[model samples]
Target: AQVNIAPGSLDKALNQYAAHSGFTLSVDASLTRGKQSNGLHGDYDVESGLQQLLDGSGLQVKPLGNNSWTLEPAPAPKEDALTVVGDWLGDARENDLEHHHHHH
Candidate 1:
């Protein structure tokens, strides 16, 4: 299969490729925002086309069977959120102990 896409908005290119290749494309709104695709100026299969399309967009795709795909990306925000949540739980648990020793 051959794919020809103009270099422009990544969102457009992505959907276009999906439409052209009949491949499934699922992406988050936030992920596609402000993204640009290199575009398929050369012949490409859906797999390779999608791989090249997502390059440099800070978005990544993982196969989910049946040609379905979902995109994902993250840095340290997830870890940071976990840390804060754990710290909050620890304080609350300690506070629970203090409750049993409360002064009347």
Candidate 2:
């Protein structure tokens, strides 16, 4: 089983991938409106293959069940804590990245 798919629209690429693999890929239409895939061009399993096709698309695959999947935006580090011995670690998630800085 080898894949040599070419780069195309997200929907087209995804369709072909699903067709070849016979897997159910549930993705929101609005999400793929302008998104695109770099295309897969080698023999790979489902996860690794999709990673190539989805790289830099800001989307990640969610495995639902046997040969089935869902797509959604990658989750940011929200409500996440990285405790360390430093004052830099703030209490709020949206403290530094939110406050854009321009030093004069």
Candidate 3:
């Protein structure tokens, strides 16, 4: 889903692509530089906000260099996007249906 854009003139290209495509361009320079810790040099620092990015630009984090990144459109989810949501009713109803006759 993520697209990696090389440095130099990537921003221009992305802007143009966004213009041509009908997707809104939301520049999130927030964590684009990624995590930074004074003592954590080689140690990796966790980065969040991918869901926020998804909501903003319909895009995912595309790593360019080590810390540099780019915004790329996310792929259409193959499975149902609602899978993350609850299906409690289905489970409860399934059990209730079997018990309905016994209870009656």
Candidate 4:
């Protein structure tokens, strides 16, 4: 579905996009409260149009089966931190198991 959303708050843009695309858009109001989009004004399918609307909003779409999408904040860089911590923990567990086997 094609839409011509004007440059404005993300809330309005999503509403218009959802109406045209015939898909449900679920988002947290706090995330969209002060967010703005350049506004998409072109022919596009549901997914592409959504990507256009979310540009610069620090958000992404998670498609749930059955023509519904949930808007979520983009993942932060903290994931890298988690990865480092996970690797350290894994190494520590392996070391403990090796020590136990040697003692037994």
Candidate 5:
């Protein structure tokens, strides 16, 4: 399962708990950072990046709506299909963050 930690510190706590539960950690700086705050004020920027470590062997990652993402398990049937879909979503997300001045 995917979990979102707010206020920054919660992330460490949650990660530690997950580890205690035998969940592998995957930190993906590529997509992490939660959502960009209005005009990228830095609240959303507090998060490091998308973490994708295998944890608990139950959770997974999946994309949802436009510029929206979700976590699931091996949800996509075809890897090729994801390339196209992911590309679009990536662009959309970049645009979203850009509109808010979010940058790497």
Candidate 6:
């Protein structure tokens, strides 16, 4: 399907595209906040058009079957190595003491 949506906030663009293409799209309010879309143009299928529309936005589409998709924010970066190590050591120490009780 060829779409001619104007450049604007990503939320509006997604809404326009969904209405125009007659496809189901579930969007997150926070995800679309402050996000922008380059706008969609030219020929495209439902998937491709959506990809183009979401380009550069920190978001992705998850298929829900029956031509429905839910938009989600990209996963946040992992915690630092030091943070992971500290958490692991704290848990290990707690567990070791928890199992150390014994008879005389």
Best by lDDT: 6
How well is each residue in 1-104 modelled by candidate 1, as lDDT tens digits? 67788877977887888887887867776856886778886777877787777765355668788988888874423332334434344544333333345566
What candidate 3 gets wrong by more than 4 Å, as runs, is 1-46, 53-57, 77-104
TM-score of each: 0.58, 0.61, 0.24, 0.61, 0.22, 0.59
Per-residue lDDT value at 62 in model 2: 73
> lDDT scores for all predictions?
0.73, 0.74, 0.39, 0.74, 0.37, 0.76
lDDT of 3 by residue, 14-35 (tens): 4433433334444554654453
Candidate 5, residues 77-104, lDDT tens digits: the string is 4334334434344543333333456678
The segments of candidate 1 whose C-alpha lies over 4 angstroms from its true place after superposition are: 57-60, 74-104
Candidate 2 similarity to native, TM-score: 0.61
Worst 10 residues of 6 by lDDT: 87-96
Please write out the lDDT profile of model 4 over residues 1-104, one tens digit for every residue. Answer: 55788976878887888788888877777856886776788888888888888775356778788878897767655433333434344543333333334553
**Regarding lDDT, does 2 or 5 come out ahead?**
2
After the best TM-score superposition of candidate 1, give how far the Cα of residue 35 lies from its true spot, in angstroms: 2.7
